[PDB]
Write a protein that binds this ligand. Structure first.
Ligand SMILES: *[C@H](O)[C@H](CC(=O)O)NC(=O)[C@H]1N(C(=O)[C@@H](NC(=O)c2ccc3ccccc3c2)C(C)C)[C@H]2CC[C@]1(O)CC2
Lengths: 87, 166
């Protein structure tokens, strides 16, 4: 028998910080979901997903009315995850 | 909702990103990439998540454009979600896949994700620790050494997330 790490290559990305609210427009959808889609469309080509999640957090940096801070949790990504869109 | 159209990597741009520090990608014509979307909109004791269809639309359109076959599950209990994740983890398609995305959209608390039956009186919670456990090397050997991206659109309590300054 050969051993393997029980937990590896994960990344979780939550819409806000522990104990705090996330926001959703009742007809236009969630703010975190809208931003993640936009940064993915723009950066999947040149950035790894860990870099994209950072860029998403950056867009929330200024607390403007409905403040929220997306957070990356329990990261065991050992490598850069490049999506290579089109391949 | 959103079209989810992505800027494509050129052959030259892809080859420029070359290393033993990147996750490998499988052949486009034969790989079987899967993604799961669990979205709770209608609830027993907590308010309806109006606008959740805009989120499902956008995420589904994006994930397909990224090469994933998308499965959408709606209005489930924490137990239903756990059984769904157990089934997803054992799908034979992960063996001929190089990665996965799990998208959760619901109400939430500090402890975790709300199911359809959640109330202060009778809790219906799917903890993040449970999601990781169901997708780990032991419970999901087909995703071993492959990136597992989890996306959570949920409150993590009812605090405003701010401190006030003069
Ligand atoms: C927590 O689970 C949830 C997010 C989700 O459903 O995933 N959060 C809420 O429901 C919170 N609220 C709202 O989101 C309200 N939305 C707004 O007031 C709003 C959001 C975004 C926006 C963008 C542009 C212009 C205006 C607005 C307005 C609600 C009406 C849906 C409220 C109820 C509970 C909350 O946790 C706090 C306030």
């Amino acid at each position: 028998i050969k051993k393997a790490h029980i937990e590896k290559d994960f990344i979780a990305f939550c819409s806000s910080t522990p104990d705090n609210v996330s926001w959703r427009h009742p007809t236009m959808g969630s703010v975190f979901i809208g931003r993640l889609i936009e940064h993915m469309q723009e950066y999947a080509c040149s950035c790894d997903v860990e870099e994209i999640f950072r860029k998403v957090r950056f867009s929330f940096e200024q607390p403007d009315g409905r403040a929220q801070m997306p957070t990356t949790e329990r990261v065991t990504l050992t490598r850069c995850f490049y999506l290579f869109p089109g391949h | 909702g959103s079209e989810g159209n992505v800027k494509l990597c050129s052959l030259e741009e892809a080859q420029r990103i070359w290393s033993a520090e990147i996750y490998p990608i499988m052949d486009k014509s034969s790989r079987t990439r899967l993604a799961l979307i669990i979205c709770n909109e209608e609830f027993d004791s907590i308010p309806r998540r109006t606008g959740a269809e805009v989120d499902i639309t956008g995420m589904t359109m994006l994930l397909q454009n990224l090469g994933y076959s998308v499965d959408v599950k709606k209005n489930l209990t924490a137990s239903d979600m756990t059984t769904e994740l157990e089934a997803f983890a054992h799908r034979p398609e992960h063996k001929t896949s190089d990665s996965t995305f799990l998208v959760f959209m619901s109400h939430g608390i500090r402890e975790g994700i709300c199911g359809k039956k959640h109330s202060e009186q009778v809790p219906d919670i799917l903890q993040l620790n449970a999601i990781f456990n169901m997708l780990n090397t032991k419970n999901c050997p087909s995703l071993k050494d492959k990136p597992k991206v989890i996306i959570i659109q949920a409150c993590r309590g009812d605090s405003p997330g701010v401190v006030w300054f003069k």
